[PDB]
């Protein structure tokens, strides 16, 4: 099992990140993450713990929405909401900040199902 980008993006964010962090990343189509970026992402998500769910998703959504807009994909608010409601917030944030290519491919899966309409 060599994942393609597309089959990898079909997994939940938490599992993509688990695979990325496993020593056994034998051939995964992911770049090596920048540790300072990873720490900044985890500190940001740490700062959301304890807040109302809407506020956590608004705060991550602000950044995720901007990221999806840079992909050139229409319907970015609806895609952002769907991702915030279907993915682990921390892992989703790591896709956003460290694994942009698999995030765009995950977004393409969503566009193919009409979830941006």
């Amino acid at each position: 099992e060599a994942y393609t980008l597309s089959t990898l993006a079909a997994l939940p964010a938490a599992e993509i990140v688990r695979l990325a962090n496993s020593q056994s990343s034998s051939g995964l189509p992911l770049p090596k993450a920048d540790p300072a970026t990873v720490k900044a992402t985890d500190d940001f998500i740490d700062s959301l713990q304890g807040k109302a769910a809407h506020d956590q998703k608004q705060k991550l959504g602000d950044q995720l929405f901007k990221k999806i807009r840079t992909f050139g994909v229409k319907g970015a608010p609806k895609l952002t909401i769907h991702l915030l409601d279907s993915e682990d917030l921390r892992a989703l944030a790591h896709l956003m900040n460290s694994y942009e290519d698999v995030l765009k491919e995950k977004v393409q899966h969503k566009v193919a199902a009409g979830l941006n309409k």
Binding site: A52, H54, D55, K57, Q58, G61, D62, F65, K66, R69, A76, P77, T80, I81, L84
Partner: peptide, 9 residues
């Protein structure tokens, strides 16, 4: 406020 989440640009 954050009822759905709101992203303006």
């Amino acid at each position: 406020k954050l009822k759905p989440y709101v992203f303006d640009y």
